[PDB]
A = this chain, B = another copy of it.
Amino acid sequence: QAVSKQQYADANAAYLQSKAAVEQARINLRYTKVLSPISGRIGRSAVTEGALV
């Protein structure tokens, strides 16, 4: 009881936002490595280095 319920609430809210932001950012980072879904013969790239995807 050294702080109000509100102050704890506000601090807990900010934390939950941060937790969320991390998890999304982690997923996007993981997607920077475009991986093969299967083993097989890959063909031609429809995309050249330096292109925007």
Contact = CB atoms under 8 A, between A and B. Distances in A.
A28 interface: no
B6 A4 contact: no
Contacts of A3: 4
Contacts of A1: 1, 4-5
Nearest to A1: B5
A2 interface: yes
Nearest to A3: B4
Interface in A1-26: 1-6
A33 to B, nearest CB: 48
A6 to B, nearest CB: 7
Given A1-B4, A2-B6, A4-B4, 5 more contacts: A1-B1, A1-B5, A2-B4, A2-B5, A3-B4
